[PDB]
Design a binder for this molecule. Structure first.
Ligand code: BCL
Ligand code: BCL
Ligand code: BPH
Ligand code: BPH
Ligand code: U10
Ligand code: 3PE
Ligand code: 3PE
Ligand code: SPO
Ligand code: SPO
Ligand code: SPO
Ligand code: SPO
Ligand code: SPO
Ligand code: FE
Lengths: 63, 54, 44, 304, 245, 281, 44, 44, 54, 44, 54, 44, 54, 54
């Protein structure tokens, strides 16, 4: 529904360019899925820590 | 040698191209990260020292 | 006629022409962004 | 949305299976029953159990050990049932102090611990004999007995062999919930960060590997239950598509695979290794190496 | 023996750890060799002997003695030949190795890919007493003790259509486990549906693996009350192949 | 090379991304798009660990250690020589693990089997992300994650555990320990039982599953079954990892004192707290 | 050269276009994350 | 006259010619970048 | 000796070429990293000392 | 002749000639690099 | 003895050659590492002392 | 006169001849390296 | 005895040869490491003392 | 006894020989190590004392 073949025979240049753009946009969305998941994980954990008591951010360093 | 083209009679070009692309991108990223790990050759830190904004 | 994709030669040429036009447009946009950044904060 | 085969969708039950005779005395078997709650994930039948001599000895002496610890706890509670519940996890039956060495100690000062330990040892030996003989009378290959022997090895190193080598029963762990955890922590502290014991690391690697391998094998078998993959023995003698698909999954994943029979060899050796290496690691502590961090520094895997 | 070294800093702990390394190397060799009793020697894409066979040699043959007098030598030519499919409707997609093989006809009907079946022995699996392990519940005295009884329920396929009704269940007698559901199609034929690839709802049995058209071509059992291992493999392969096809 | 039965299973289809672009094998390894990404991430992580060894100045494999940025750095992206290399390696490891799971999903789809293996692997991935991402961010800094070293991360484990006294007293920790011990015990029993059925006493024919059920019913009065034992082993391992993750999640975020002191609410319940005698007076 | 179009006779363009989109997005993300490391170019 | 890939001799020659053109372009760009860096920040 | 070509009668070129490529890449990377880990032969360090970059 | 890989004698000879040419080029480049390093920073 | 060629009547050449290559590489690496861990025979350290690099 | 591998006596002789030539070359190179090391830094 | 050859009627020659080679290599490595662990028989240390290295 | 040969009618010769070889090697190594741990019977220490090596 997102990755579709192109009808090269009986196909205009403008449609070909739009199709290449759509394929690359779908690829960009697929590549954005892990970036968005990681950003959400990090920021949500940080926000939850911000909502934690004050002692959560004062633990001794394990090194 | 002028007969190196025969490598394509041995190895499938598609898999060779995939491996070459992965290898070259990996190598470029590795060299850039090595240069960034060295403060003398970290061009961002060099620009920071040269222009002096932080 | 060596083809691993089911594409004819002329179709490949036209597709490559369109792809290269788009690539040049993308390069131009990237160049504009880099010039803006260089004016704002040079890294050399 | 598909059926994951973690629980049965429907249960069926007839007369309970009373077991194959082979060379087993059927007079020693009890009656059997059903428990429908256990039939969702496994078998609902609480089948017959063999009584025999080894089972009777093991039950009697294990109950004696359990009741010895219990009456010691009641003595520590001063007959008070409310103190018994309030401090149940804090009660401890400690070994004799280091002054008495390996000799019989007074009851209040470790004799009760020695009595309980002897009862426990008798029970464990009887249960090992039971495992071996139940394997033998059905014509099976004694693998369970050898697997149990590794755990027995670790258990006897903790309580018998290392105390003998150290010259006192005091170094053995006590009988208690919180007290034996304290004993474990104090052992690590006294022998210089047991993390740096190489056999301790091997035992931890084997434990992690046992968890990993059982996860892999269970997931693989449940994945091929579409083709009757859990019938492992028949797949061993008459290979089906389930075995082939499992082998091909793991070969395409990591480049090498197992067979329906050899995966269980992997499993048994991985599980045996944790106790096999742990016994050696415990036996080396105090008798050969008394500070594992300094030993690691000498042998090049700790910073100087 | 604290601080007692045989030479240099080599003490009892060092001897133990090096002995363990040697023993672990031997154990890994033994475990790898024990797992090479099936699927070897390796072949190429044309079915010919592969020039590379790996560093681990194939172990010496071992024999399994069956209750009916049959002997199975698992690493043998006979074992490989008995389980080898023939006349596979497959075609290479490339001259190079490592490329997929293309099904020439109907992959589900031809039994290739995820619909592949193994030619198991054409006899039913038996228990220790010699009785057939899997029998229909009408031939036993078992009863439904929990869950939902699917007998009499309609069968809905993956295309949201009714293809028949459940008439009986097939049960592993030694394990007391339901393994197959018998369905009478609207055409009157009876098929076997694996329990592991269907869902039992409150009012229906849903089979999403295959559509209505594919229910008529499910492989059949020769005898109405006996299912063999080969028939089990074929039915399971056909039903599981519907997810891809 | 191929196994003697492998040819009929190497068919096209089952990929998630790219169609037939990467639908091929290299030796025994199926590649796919996620295999390409896995090889990239794994090679980059390995080479960056080697480079961090070069910066550290040691080539002993047991002394190499890459440390996260200091606690004072917060959640900022650190300099490569000041903990940023650890962050890059962590990103590479996460990418490699996720790509491995998705490649396993593709292999499952090609072979027509279930996804129990990738789900179980995702459980371990969740545990790893708990130790390196969730807990350090809930504590406000990347500096609370463990380092990448064979024994230095053991030092990290020791220090983190002793931050809260004796870590044995964490209840979720006790549950995880019990589950791991049970998993090892069950694996030993299952391997031994299957091998003893497959390798009977010399001169005897191969044993049936009825023999296994009879053996375990004779020994202890109950048999779970082959399907049951596989389900039980998988669930035991998954629960062990999940409860270990929970034990680490609750420590340092909502609990900061000694767990041995946590265990004293039962003792200090007022209706028997002052009753003289016993251990706690 | 002018014969680069034959790359489309080797790899099927649509899948290649999807992969290129993935690669370009991830490369941009990586470059932004690298820029965040130095305060001088930290735009946040 | 062995051919593991199934390509003929002339097909291999044409593929190698295009591949060498691509490699030449890549190496030329790399040489220019190296010269620019050597002028900007010598490492020898 | 001039009969070493018979090695290709024993080993398939494709597998040998792949193994050789992996071996050479790993060996070159290892030697470069060994030189970089030694400040006496770290060329970036030598250049920094020579040109006064820090 | 004995051939596990299926190649003939002459195919092996031709492949070995090409392989030896490649190895010779690689060794020549390595020798030049080692000479340059020895001149710039001797390790003996 | 002139009859040692008969070893090839007992052992398959492919596995023997693979094992020999791996063994020789590991042995050479072991000897080189033993020399490198000894400062008296570490050629990099000796070169540094001889030329005053550090 | 056994053959586990399936080779003939003459095939084994040819294989051994090639193997001994390779081993001789390897040993000669090792001897030259050892002589050079002994000259540079003797260990006896 | 003169009829030790009959050992080859009991054990497969290939497995015996492989086990013997592994055993001999491990034994030689162990003896060499024992001598290297003893300073009086560490030939590298003796050479260092005699030729004045370090 | 002149009838000890019948032991080979009870136990497989291959297993017995393999176990005996492993047992004898382990016993010999253990005894040698025990002697090496005792300085009064460590022959390397005795040689060092006699010849004045260290
Ligand atoms: C789980 C809670 C703690 C922790 C606590 C401990 C303790 C306590 C111990 C270990 C031990 C080990 N841990 Mg740790 N460990 C953690 C997280 C990790 C992670 C990770 C990315 O999550 C990894 C890869 C490791 C890796 C390892 C191994 C070096 C070792 C044996 C494990 C094993 O066999 O497992 C089962 C897996 C298998 C059997 C399969 C094979 C796995 C191989 C052995 C992994 C090798 C990794 C290699 C050294 C480095 C990887 C990166 C390279 C670039 C490839 N740890 C966290 C922080 N770990 C033990 C040890 O000996 O330490 C010295 C030990 O005592
Ligand atoms: C601060 C505490 C110390 C420490 C101190 C010790 C000590 C001390 C010991 C271990 C031991 C073990 N530790 Mg440690 N350990 C620490 C940190 C860790 C960490 C971690 C940080 O992640 C991990 C994963 C481990 C993991 C492990 C295991 C691999 C190992 C053996 C486990 C086992 O099977 O036990 C339990 C299994 C048994 C005791 C076997 C029992 C067999 C008998 C026959 C069965 C029971 C008898 C009878 C039937 C009972 C009644 C039953 C009735 C039905 C009621 N340790 C730190 C560093 N650890 C042991 C070991 O081997 O170390 C080398 C050990 O003795
Ligand atoms: C490979 C190493 C792993 C392992 C292996 C292993 N253990 C094994 C086996 C194997 C292969 C067996 O064959 C054997 C077995 O039979 O398993 C079912 C066993 C076994 N491992 C056991 C336990 C066990 N294993 C452990 C560990 C492990 N065992 C390792 C992880 C642990 C841990 C982690 O601490 C424990 C607790 C047992 C279930 C069993 C051995 C049974 C036994 O020895 O019984 C004799 C002992 C007793 C009878 C003691 C007393 C029991 C009761 C407390 C008696 C008193 C109560 C009375 C009956 C009722 C009172 C009612 C009221 C009046 C109160
Ligand atoms: C139920 C959870 C248990 C489990 C499950 C599990 N793990 C699994 C699977 C399953 C079901 C797989 O399918 C998968 C697999 O393929 O197994 C063969 C996997 C796997 N479990 C593995 C290991 C492993 N599992 C562990 C734990 C467990 N896994 C749990 C107990 C541990 C522990 C406790 O330490 C380890 C080490 C791998 C063998 C494998 C996944 C392989 C993989 O991801 O491959 C791709 C990545 C690489 C080849 C290398 C990447 C390297 C990085 C880029 C750089 C290094 C980064 C790392 C953080 C450094 C760490 C240093 C250490 C000293 C800390
Ligand atoms: C009954 O059924 C079952 C089977 O079958 C019968 C099985 O086999 C198995 C599997 C078990 C098998 C032996 C037993 C033991 C397995 C393991 C113990 C765990 C140890 C694993 C250790 C390291 C990991 C091994 C491999 C790891 C990651 C993989 C490393 C390999 C590669 C990294 C490279 C990946 C290449 C990828 C695509 C291809 C790259 C090529 C390109 C272009 C790209 C189980 C569980 C099972 O239950
Ligand atoms: C340190 C831990 C990690 C070790 C290094 C990585 C391990 C994986 C390396 C090999 C993976 C691979 O590439 O697979 C292909 C290769 C060859 O496989 P194949 O050709 O089929 O071998 C038989 C043919 N003669 O694979 C093979 O060589 C087949 C032999 C398997 C390799 C053994 C690796 C051990 C895996 C478990 C590690 C922990 C062992 C603990 C076991 C305890 C006892 C159960
Ligand atoms: C790095 C340089 C690689 C450049 C080569 C690019 C070609 C793409 C890779 C490839 O084609 O793999 C195929 C390889 C050869 O096997 P195959 O072609 O399938 O059939 C021949 C058997 N007669 O199939 C293989 O599996 C290669 C054989 C591997 C030999 C040992 C590898 C050890 C190191 C592996 C990396 C870790
Ligand atoms: C750590 O290392 C760092 C990150 C520091 C440095 C590492 C760096 C690297 C290695 C960076 C990049 C390597 C590459 C290889 C980057 C990308 C090269 C390419 C090949 C980019 C391709 C851009 C192509 C693009 C967007 C597609 C353009 C096509 C667009 C729509 C579709 C074509 C349709 C076109 C209709 C017509 C429109 C155009 C006009 C003029 C009308
Ligand atoms: C700390 O302990 C220490 C390390 C000090 C102890 C030191 C230990 C040892 C144990 C050192 C070494 C012992 C050995 C055994 C060293 C190696 C001896 C060998 C066996 C060297 C082998 C060299 C063989 C070489 C290069 C291969 C020559 C073969 C070359 C190509 C292959 C040609 C043969 C062919 C091609 C097949 C073609 C012919 C036909 C008919 C197809
Ligand atoms: C710190 O120091 C370190 C550790 C980094 C030192 C490590 C160093 C290394 C290992 C450096 C590099 C070793 C290599 C091996 C570098 C790369 C050499 C190569 C071989 C680069 C190749 C670049 C190839 C390029 C651009 C060509 C891509 C080819 C193309 C566009 C053309 C192909 C498209 C085609 C041919 C048409 C074919 C189809 C038809 C129908 C004719
Ligand atoms: C710790 O120890 C340290 C690391 C310090 C030192 C230890 C060091 C060692 C042991 C280093 C290295 C030992 C070796 C043996 C390194 C490798 C030497 C080799 C053998 C390099 C081989 C280079 C081969 C090269 C470039 C050739 C690749 C071949 C080609 C281009 C030719 C292509 C061939 C054939 C195309 C196609 C023919 C097709 C037809 C149809 C005729
Ligand atoms: C109302 O409640 C009643 C009174 C009915 C019963 C309540 C009972 C309780 C509360 C029972 C137990 C609570 C506990 C806490 C039992 C034990 C838990 C543990 C953790 C036992 C751990 C033993 C742990 C280890 C290492 C012991 C290994 C023991 C050994 C090898 C045995 C050593 C054997 C023999 C030493 C020494 C023989 C030498 C002589 C001189 C006799
Ligand atoms: Fe199993």
């Amino acid at each position: 529904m997102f990755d579709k073949p192109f009808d090269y025979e009986n196909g205009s240049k403008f449609e070909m360019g739009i199709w290449i753009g759509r394929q690359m946009a779908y690829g960009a969305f697929l590549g954005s899925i892990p970036f968005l998941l990681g950003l959400g994980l990090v920021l949500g954990s940080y926000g939850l820590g911000l909502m934690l008591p004050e002692r959560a951010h004062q633990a001794p360093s394990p090194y | 040698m002028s007969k190196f083209y025969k490598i394509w009679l041995v190895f499938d070009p598609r898999r060779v191209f995939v491996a070459q692309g992965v290898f070259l991108f990996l190598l470029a990223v590795l060299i850039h990260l090595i240069l960034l790990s060295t403060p003398a050759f970290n061009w961002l830190t060099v620009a920071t020292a040269k222009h002096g904004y932080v | 006629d060596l083809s691993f994709t089911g594409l004819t030669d002329e179709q490949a040429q036209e597709l490559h022409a369109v792809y290269m036009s788009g690539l040049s447009a993308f390069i131009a946009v990237a160049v504009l962004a880099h010039l803006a950044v260089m004016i704002w904060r040079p890294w050399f | 949305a598909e059926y994951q085969n973690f629980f049965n969708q429907v249960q069926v039950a007839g007369a309970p299976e009373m077991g194959l005779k082979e060379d087993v005395d059927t007079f020693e078997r009890t009656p059997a029953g059903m428990f429908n709650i256990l039939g969702w994930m496994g078998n609902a039948q609480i089948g017959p159990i063999y009584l025999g001599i080894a089972g009777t000895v093991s039950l009697a002496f294990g109950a004696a050990w359990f009741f010895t610890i219990g009456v010691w706890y009641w003595y520590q509670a001063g007959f008070d049932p409310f103190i018994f519940m309030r401090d149940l996890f804090f009660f401890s039956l400690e070994p004799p102090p280091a002054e008495y060495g390996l000799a019989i100690a007074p009851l209040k000062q470790g004799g009760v611990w020695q009595i309980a330990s002897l009862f426990m040892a008798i029970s464990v030996i009887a249960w090992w004999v039971r495992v071996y003989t139940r394997a033998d009378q059905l014509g099976m290959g004694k693998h369970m007995a050898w697997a149990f022997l590794s755990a027995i090895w670790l258990w006897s190193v903790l309580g018998f062999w290392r105390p003998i080598l150290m010259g006192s029963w005091s170094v053995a762990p006590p009988y208690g919930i919180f007290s034996h955890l304290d004993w474990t922590n104090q052992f690590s502290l006294d022998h210089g960060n047991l993390f740096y014991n190489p056999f301790h690391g091997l035992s931890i690697a084997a434990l992690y590997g046992s968890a990993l391998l059982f996860a892999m094998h269970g997931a693989t078998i449940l994945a091929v239950t579409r083709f009757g993959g859990e019938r492992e023995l028949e797949q061993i003698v008459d290979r089906g598509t389930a075995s082939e698909r499992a082998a091909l999954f793991w070969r395409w994943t990591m480049g090498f695979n197992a067979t329906m029979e050899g995966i269980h060899r992997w499993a048994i050796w991985m599980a045996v290794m944790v106790t096999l290496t742990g016994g050696i690691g415990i036996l080396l502590s105090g008798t050969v190496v008394d500070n594992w961090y300094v030993w690691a520094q000498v042998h090049g895997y700790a910073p100087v | 023996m604290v601080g007692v070294n045989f030479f240099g800093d080599f003490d009892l702990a060092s001897l133990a750890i090096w002995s363990f390394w040697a023993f672990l190397a031997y154990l890994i060799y033994y475990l790898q060799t024990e797992n090479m009793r099936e699927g070897y020697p390796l072949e190429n894409d044309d079915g010919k002997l592969s020039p590379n066979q790996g560093p681990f040699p194939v172990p010496s043959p071992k024999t399994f003695d069956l209750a009916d007098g049959r002997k199975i030598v698992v690493p043998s030519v006979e074992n490989e030949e008995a389980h080898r499919r023939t006349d596979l409707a497959l075609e290479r997609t490339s001259v190079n190795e490592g490329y997929p093989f293309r099904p020439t006809g109907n992959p589900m009907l031809d039994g290739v890919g995820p619909a592949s079946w193994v030619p198991r022995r054409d006899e039913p699996e038996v228990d220790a007493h010699g009785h057939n392990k899997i029998q229909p519940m009408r031939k036993t005295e078992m009863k439904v003790s929990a869950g939902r009884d699917p007998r009499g329920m309609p069968v809905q396929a993956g295309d949201t259509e009714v293809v028949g009704k459940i008439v009986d269940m097939w049960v592993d007698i030694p394990e007391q486990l339901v393994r197959y559901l018998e369905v009478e199609l609207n055409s009157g034929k009876k098929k076997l549906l694996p329990m592991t690839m269907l869902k039992i709802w409150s009012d229906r049995v849903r089979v999403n693996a295959i559509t209505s058209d594919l229910f008529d071509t499910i492989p059949d059992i020769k005898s109405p009350d006996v299912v063999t291992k080969l028939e089990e493999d074929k039915i399971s392969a056909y039903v599981a192949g519907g997810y891809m096809y | 090379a191929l196994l003697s039965f492998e040819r009929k299973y190497r068919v096209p289809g089952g990929t998630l991304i790219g169609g037939s672009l990467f639908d091929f094998w290299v030796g025994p390894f199926y590649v796919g798009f996620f295999g390409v990404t896995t090889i990239f991430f794994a090679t980059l992580g390995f080479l960056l660990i080697l480079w961090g060894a070069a910066m550290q100045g040691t080539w002993n494999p047991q002394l190499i250690s890459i440390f996260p940025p200091p606690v004072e750095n917060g959640l900022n992206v650190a300099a490569l020589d000041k903990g940023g290399l650890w962050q890059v390696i962590t990103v590479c490891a996460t990418g490699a693990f996720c790509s491995w799971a998705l490649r396993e999903v593709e292999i499952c789809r090609k072979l027509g089997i279930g996804f129990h293996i990738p789900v179980a692997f995702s459980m371990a991935i969740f545990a790893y992300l708990t130790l390196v991402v969730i807990r350090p961010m809930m504590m406000g800094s990347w500096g609370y994650a463990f380092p990448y070293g064979i024994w230095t991360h053991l030092d990290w484990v020791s220090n983190t555990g002793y931050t809260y006294g004796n870590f044995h007293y964490n209840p979720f920790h006790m549950l995880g320990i019990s589950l791991f011990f049970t998993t090892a015990w069950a694996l030993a029993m299952h391997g031994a039982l299957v091998l003893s059925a497959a390798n009977p006493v010399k001169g005897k024919t191969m044993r049936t599953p009825d023999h296994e059920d009879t053996y375990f019913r004779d020994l202890m009065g109950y048999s779970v079954g082959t399907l049951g034992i596989h389900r039980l082993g998988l669930l035991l391992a998954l629960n062990a990892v999940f409860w270990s993750a929970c034990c680490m999640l609750v420590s340092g975020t909502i609990y900061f004192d000694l767990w041995s002191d946590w265990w004293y609410w039962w003792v200090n319940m007022p209706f028997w707290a002052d009753m003289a005698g016993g251990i706690n007076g």
